[model samples]
Target chain A: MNTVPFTSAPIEVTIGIDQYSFNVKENQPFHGIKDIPIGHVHVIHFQHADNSSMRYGYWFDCRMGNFYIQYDPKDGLYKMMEERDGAKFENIVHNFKERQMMVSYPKIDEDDTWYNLTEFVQMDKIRKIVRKDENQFSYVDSSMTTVQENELSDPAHSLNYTVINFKSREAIRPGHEMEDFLDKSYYLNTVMLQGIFKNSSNYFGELQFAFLNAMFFGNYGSSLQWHAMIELICSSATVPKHMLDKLDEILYYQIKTLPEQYSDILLNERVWNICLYSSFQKNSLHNTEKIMENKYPELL
Target chain B: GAMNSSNYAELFNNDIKLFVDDTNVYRVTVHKTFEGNVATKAINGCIFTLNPKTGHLFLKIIHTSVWAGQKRLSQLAKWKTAEEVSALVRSLPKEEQPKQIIVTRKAMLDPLEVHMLDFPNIAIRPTELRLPFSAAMSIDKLSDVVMKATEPQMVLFNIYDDWLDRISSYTAFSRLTLLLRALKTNEESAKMILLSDPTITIKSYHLWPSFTDEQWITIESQMRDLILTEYGRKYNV
Candidate 1:
C-alpha cells in the first residue's frame, strides 16, 4: 500500500503588527513573510502535538529577504516558493480584479484631504525578490546626501521621507542600491496601498447613487458627493504604513481565493459596497449577514 | 414610406412571375409615390431590367421629376414608361430575352400593372434580396444576389426608388458602385448600366448625411475610372 506524502492544516501567522493566515496541506504551502525587517529570520513548525514523527515546518527569510519556505513531503526537504512576476502580478491584482482595490489618486489640487506619496522608491525590487535563503541584502542610509534636513522639516516631505532598510546574509543581490532601492520600494508600496481604497464597493455605490440622484436633485452635483464618499471611506480605515506594505501579499492571496461567480462588476459594486460599508460602520460581519438576509428574506 | 404592403403585394402578385423559358433578358417596372404639395402622387415611369447571363443591372431614369410632377416634366423628355420598356423587353430576340428580371422600385409595378399585357419573367424584387445585417433588403443586395445566382446570366436593379429615399440611397449607391467595381475586377465582361434624373433635387431626412448627389457623381466617376484603369473596360452606359 502507498502512503500519502503529506498532511496539512490551516495556519495563521503574525509578523510584527501584520497577520496572515492561509491553508497549508503537506506539499501545498503558504508564504506570508514579506515586509519583515532584515536579519529577522523566522521559522514556524507544524506537527501533531502528541506525535513528534508527524513533522512539518516553514521558514521566512528577511535577509536580502522576503520569501517563504515549506517542507515538501515528496522531496523530504523544505522548498522555496515563487513570487509572481510583474505581468502576472498586474493581471491578478490590477486588471479589474477587485473594484474596491482599484483606487485612483486624485491630483493634489483636486483634494488635499488624502495623503499622497511624492515618489515611488522600491516597488520593482520588492516585487522581483525571489524566495531563496542563500542571498543576503542590505541598504546603505543616504538620507543626508539626497534629502536636506531643511527639506525634511517641510510639512510635505516630513512623513514621506522615512525609508526602510534591508541587509542580506550573503552578498547583496542585484538592484538593491540604498537610495534607489529605498525610493522605489517606498513609492511602489504607497501606490499599491492607495490603489486599495479605490476598490471599495461602498464608495462606488455611493458615487453611482450620487449620479442617479443628481439627475433629479438639481442643487447637489455628483462631484461633491464623490469627494464626500472618498473622504468617508478613506478615514474609515486607519491603515498604518507597515500594514499597508504587508497587505499587498495578503490581499493578493485573498483575491485569488475569490469565487468565479464574484464577477468584477459584482465585487466592485454590490459586494464591495457591502464590505466597505460594514467595515466603515464598525459592524465587522453584520453587513455580510444583512446581505444574506436581503438575498434570502424567505429563509428567515 | 408610402409604399404600403397591399399595394406592394398587388404589384408583386400581378407584375412579377418566375421565368421558365430560354429568354435571357427581362424588364420590370414599379410605381412609387412622391411627396407632393397637396397630396402624394405615384410616379409611374421608372424602368429597370436584369440580364442573368452576365449578371448586369440596368436602370432607365425619366427626366421628369417624379416628386415635383408637371412643373418638372418639361425639364427633359420623360424616358420610356414602364409599359413601353416592358414592351421593348418582350420584343427582344429569343437569345437576347432575359431569363430573370428584377424590379427594384415598388412604383415601377404600379404603372406596368395598368398597361403592359405580357409580363416578363420577373424572378424577385431587389428589395427582397437583403444583406445579413442591414435593416432593409434594398439595392445593397443587387450585386450580391446577381453574382451568387446559380444561373449564369444578368440582372437589373431599378434603384431610382432607392435613390429617392434618403437612407436607402446612400447604402444603395455606395454598395452598388463598390460591388460593381468588385464585379469588374473578377469578370472581364461585367456590365453595369446606371440611369438617373439629373433635374430632381435629392433630399435627406437623416440626422447624419452620408453622401450628396455631387459626391455620388464623383464616386460614379471614380468607379468608372477604376474599371477603366484596372480592368481596361468602360463602365458607363
Candidate 2:
C-alpha cells in the first residue's frame, strides 16, 4: 500500500504514442512477486477494456501461482479463520452463525470476471460482513444476489457447496475444474499484474493486444509470447542496443507460439506464417490486433 | 470493501480479545493510593494498541495513569503465572529485561466457565444419542458427533459440501471450526476426546474436501464416536 512517486524519462513521441515511459528503481522499494526469490520474471504489455495501453511485470518463483489458481475462493474464508486475532475470529464466527455468510463473502458471484470480482473481494471492510442484509449494512452497495445470481444458475453449483463433515458427500461439478483454473489464474493475475495495469497510462493503448493475448493465449503454455509483450513495454530509447536487438526474437517466439489450442495452430507453421506476414505488413504495430488484422486479411 | 472490513473485524474478534488504553503516551504521571504509597505502575492496561496495523503485537506495560482505558480478557490471559498478576502479562515468550516492554494491562477477567473448565481431573465420556442412524444424523452430522463425543463443549454446525455448491444454501464449516477452536483449549480430555490420534486419524481423511457431504458426515460422526468411546474407556475409570 506504500506508493513512491516516480517520473518517466523522455522518449520519442512515436514510441510515446504507443508506450508510457516511467521508471522505478531496479529494486522497487516494495517487495511483491518480483522480489519473491527464485521465480523468473514474466513481464507483459497489454490493454485493458478501456483500450488503454499498459505494461505488466510478474515474477513466478514457483508453482505457487498454479496452487493459488487451484484454490477454492470460499477457502479464503477458512484462511481468515486461521488468521483470526482472538475475538475477531470468534466475532465473525458469531456473526456468521447469526447471519449465515462466509467470513470473506463479498456476495460477488463466482462468474463475475476475475478483475471486477477481485476488486470487490479485496476490500477488507466488505469481506468481513458477507452475510449481513445489504440494505441494513451501510457500506454494502449491492445485494448478495446481484453479485452471485449467475452462480445460483450455474449447473455445477461449485460455489455454493459446503463441507458437512469428514464423511458428508458434496457433488463435485465439472465447473469445479473451470472454477479451480479461474480462481488460480485470477489470484495470480491479481497478485501480479492487475496493479501495474491500473497504474499504466499508455499500457491500454499500445500493448492492449499483449494483455489480451497473455490473458487468453499466454495463460496456456506460451512463455515467450508473454516475454515478448513485457519486453516491448519496458523498452525505451535509453535501453541498450543489445536488448533492443532481442526484441525481434522475442516477437518471433511470441508470434510463433501465440495461437490458441488446436491441431493446425499446434504446428506453429500457419501461425508463424500469419505472424510473419502480419509483422511485415503492420511493421512496428504488430502488437496492435486490429491494425495487424487490417494489414493481413487472411491472418485475421 | 465494506463487507471485507466487517469480515476482518468479525474474524479478529473471534480469534482475540481487544482492549483500549485510557492513558496518553506523551505524558507520564503517577497515581497516589489512599495509603499515600505512589503506584509505581503505569496507567496502562493489559491491552496493546487501539488499532493494530501489523501481525506483530506490541505488548507493553504502561503502568502510568491515563485519560481513558478499556480492558478485555484474551485467551492468552489463561497462561499467566503466579509471578505476574494475570496470565496475560507473563505468557509472552520473551519478557526479558527490556529495551521495550509491552506491559499494558486490562481489568477484564477470564470467563468463569473457561476457568472452571481448567479442572485437572475432569471426567471424559462419549455422547449418547436419542436416535441411532438417521438422515437428520446425516444433516446435522458434525453437531451430532460433538454432542455424542465430548462433554459440555460447544458444537458448531456446518453445511453439507453438496449444499455448498448451490451458492444459495448455507453450510457449517466456518462455525464448526471456530467453536472447535474455542472449546478445545483447556482440557486434556477435550483434546483426547476430539482430535486424538490412532483412534480417529485414519478416518480423518473423510473430513477432507474430496468426500460427498453425506459420506463425509456419516464417517466423521462414526469416528467421533470411536474417539469419544476410546477416550472414555481408557481415562474415565
Candidate 3:
C-alpha cells in the first residue's frame, strides 16, 4: 500500500491526505529546501486603522516593513499594481515570474543551496455577500493536495483541507524535531494563503472554506493546512504555469507597491515566504499537470 | 575744592558743551552738595552729567595759580559716612554687560558680565562661560551694575538684586546651548584648518557656516564695539 492516502470519491479525494510524513530531517539538498534553514515563521492578525472594530484575515510570514494584501475600496479588484507610474498589471506579473524563476530547482541538486524571494497575495474584494457566518478565506494545503487540486477544487475536500496530522505517526517522532518542523510548516502555509489570496482567481473563494475546515480540526491542524498548502505549491504543480505567473504579479505588486509604512516589516520575511510559496506552488502544478495528463490525455 | 550748587551746574554745562555738545547741558544736575572743609580741599566739586554715556559725570577745576587771593573762599569736606566711601569703592572697575542674559547661558555657567575686568584671563569666552550662580543672580548683577554706574565719576558698581528679576526666563535655553557649542567648535575647527600648515595662514570669520546671521551680527558688533571703546578710552581717558 502507498504510504500516502488517496480516495476514489471526488469529495473525499479533494482534500487529499497522507499517513506518512516526508522526513525533512535527512540532509538531502532537494528535500530540505531552505538556504537559511529557518525554523519558524510568524502569523499576524491584520487590522485596518479605519475599521478597528473588525479584524481581517490573519497574515503569515509577517515581518518588519511589509504591508499585507489590502483592498482599495475605490477600485473593485485587489490593487495588485503597487503605486508606480508607467507600470501596469503586466509589470507586476513579470516581477513575480522573475522571483519564481530564481528559486525553482531543476531535478534534485546534490547541494540544496537556493535563493528565496518574497511576494504578496491579496484578495479580490474587501467584502462579498457570501453569507453571515460562512466566509471565504484563501490558503495553500502543504500535505496532500497540489495547486491543481486547490484551483479546480477537484477532490471536493480540497476545499476542506482535511489532511490534519496533529497526532499522527509522522507528526509525533522520537526527537522534538517534528514539532519544530510543524512550526515552520505552519508559517509556510500562511505564505501560501497570502499567495493565493493575493492573486485574483476562482480558487480565491475556497481559502475561507479550507481555513474554516482546518480551524475546525484545531489551530495546529489549521496551521498544518497552511503548511501543506505552501509545501504542495513548492513541491508539486497544482496551479497552471500561466496562473502561477499571475500569482507572481500579485506579489510584485505587493512588494513594490506596498506603502512606506510597511516597507521595513515586509523586507524582513518577504524573501523567505516568497521562496517557500513559489517553490511549493510551482512543484505542485508541475506534478499535478503530469498526473492529470496521464489520466486524461484528451484534456492535454 | 567744594563749589556751591550754582558753580557745580556752570562747570558741568561748560564740560558738556566741550565734549558731547552745548545742547546736552540741561541734562546735568547737582544731586548733592557739601561745603568745602580741610578733608574736601583735595576734592574738586563733583561734576554730574545727564549724558548717559558719561555716567552723568563732568569735572570743574579751580586753578590754584589764579586763586591765590581767593584762598579764604575755598573750603573742603571729607566723606562723613561709610555709605559715601562704599559708593566710591564700587566705581573703580568697569566692564561691558549684555543687555539680555539668557537662561541657557546661565545653565552652562556663562558669565553674564561680558566686559568684566577678570573675564579676559578666563579660558572660556562669554559664549563658553557658564554662570556660577542661579539665573536670578546673573541677571541681577547685570542690571545693578548698569543702574548704579550712572553716578558721575563712578569707577565701579555692584549689579543689584532687582535687575536679576527682569531676566530669569528659560526662553530658547536648549537651542542657545546647541548654537553656542556649534559656534565654539566651528571657530576652533576653522582656526585649526587655516593654520594646519604653517606655510599658509587664513584669518577670516567667513569660513564658518555654523553661526546664524543673528549670531554673526551680534558677535561682530560686540567685538567691534569692544575694540573701539577700549582703544579710544585708553588714549582719551
Candidate 4:
C-alpha cells in the first residue's frame, strides 16, 4: 500500500507497473532487483554478449561523464580509487545564472543530489561487486537459487554501456519547457565541455556523459535524449537531483576553465558557440593559476 | 598647364608605381618629389594600390603645395572605357587634370568586371561619420575589420560574395555575426591608436579569414573594387 512501489520485490514492484507484464517467474531460476531511471532517457550499464542490454539486477545512476560505469577488462572490478585531488574548482568563478535559474520539472533540492562518480569511485565500504569467470556477476540476491540463474553469462565488465533509451512522458503539461531552456542556452552556444582524465578514460570522463546527452538531446543534436537532459538542467521538465548535478557540474567546470570564452559569450547574454579553441600564447598567459592556496578542501 | 597627354615628357612617364609597403598591404605613399609637395613629381600627387591578395584598391591624397589635404576624404576603384575615362579627367577641376592620362582608374561595375566586386549601380546610401576610429592599422587591424567589425567607417564590412558564401558554410553566419559585434568595442579605445609618424591607417582592405589562398585574392579584389567604386562616387577619383 506504499505510495512508492516497494523497492524489494517478487521482481514486479516498480511503482507505476500495476500489473505484471511478463509471465510470473516460471522456471526463472532466481530473480534479481531491477530499476528504471527517473527521467525520460537512460543509458545501460552492462550488457550480454549478444549485444542486448542486461536490464535485470542493475541500478543505473547519473554518473561522472561516462554514460555508464566503466569497469576494468582484466579484473572485472570498477576502477576504484582513493586519496586524490578530486575535481577542484576553487577561486574559479562560475558565471552560470545560478541565481536566476528556475526549476519545476522534478523539483530537486540538494539533499536528493547524488554524489558524482568522482565521489562514488572513492567509496568501497558500502558499494560492492563480485565476479565469476569473465562474463558472470553475483552481488545482488547472492543466495543460491535455480541452476539457470547461477549459469547466467554477460559481456565483459568493460562493456558497461550497450544501449541508450528514452522514456518520454511527453503528453504531460509544462514538460516541453525544459527542452526550450536547453535549446536556447546550450545549443545556441554549442560547447563541447569535456573532462580530462587519463587517455583511456576519455570517453568515460565525468563530463563526457553529459556531453553525450547534450549532443543527442540538445537542439544541435543526436535525439530525444536531450528531452530528459533539458529537464536535467535547472528546468521544470524535472530530471531530479542526480541528473541535475550531472549537467550542472560539467557546465560549471567549463566556466572555470574557459572564463573568457564564457565571459565573452555571456557578455551579450544570448549565448555563443565555437570559441572553444585559443592560441597557445593566450593559454600560457591566461592559465597562470596564481591563487595557490587551499583551493581544494573548500570546494571539491 | 600642359593638360594634354602629348605635352608631358615621355622620359619621366606617368607610370605610377603603387607597390606593397613594408606591412605587405598595398596602399599609396606620400611621395615627396618637389619642395615638400606630394606632386613635386607627376606621379606624386595621388597614388593608388590594389592588394594582389584582396583586390582592395586604395588611393592616398596627401597635402601638396597646390592641392588642399581635403581633396579626398576616403579611398577604395576601376578601369573604365577610354572615352569615359577622358570624360572623368575632364570633369576634374582644370588645375587638377593631368596633361597625360596613363591608365583609367575607374574600374567597371558588376557583370562587366568578371572577377572583381562590381561598381555601385547608381545605388547605396550615405551613413554618418564612423567616428574616432583610431588605428595605425596593420594585419591585426585588418583582421579585426574583416573577421570582426569596424566603427566610424559605418559601411557594412563587405567581402566577396562567393567568399562570404564560402565563409558562411565554415562557420555559422549568425554566430560569426555575433562574434564580430562583440569584438567591435573590445578594442574600442577612447582615442585613435594611430602611429601618425609612420602614417599607417588602412580603411580600405578588410581582414577576412578566407577559404583558400586563391579565394582570398578574389575577396581582396572585390573589397578593393568596392572601395574603388565607393571613392569614385565620393571624390570622382
**Predicted model with the maximum lDDT:** 1
**Every candidate's chain B TM-score:** 0.29, 0.21, 0.15, 0.21
Which stretch of 10 consecutive residues in model 3 chain B shows the poorest summed lDDT? Answer: B17-26
Best by DockQ: 4
Cα lDDT tens digits, model 1, A130-160, are: 1222333211111212122243233321111
For candidate 4, the share of real interface contacts preserved is 0.00
Q: Of models 1 and 2, which has the larger lDDT? A: 1
Where is model 3 more than 4 Å wrong at Cα? Answer: A1-200, A205-231, A237-239, A263-300, B1-237
All candidates: TM-score: 0.17, 0.16, 0.17, 0.19
| Interface DockQ of candidate 1 | 0.00
Q: Give the top-scoring candidate (TM-score).
A: 4
Q: Candidate 1's error at A189, in angstroms?
A: 98
- Could you give candidate 2's fraction of true interface contacts? 0.00
Q: Write down the TM-score for model 1.
A: 0.17
Candidate 2: how large is its RMSD?
31.6
Q: Which DockQ values do the candidates obtain, in the order shown? A: 0.00, 0.01, 0.00, 0.02
Candidate 3 lDDT (Cα, 0 to 1): 0.28
lDDT of 3 by residue, B127-223 (tens): 2234122221112222233334333333222111121233221222222223333333343432333234464422232112333346545544544
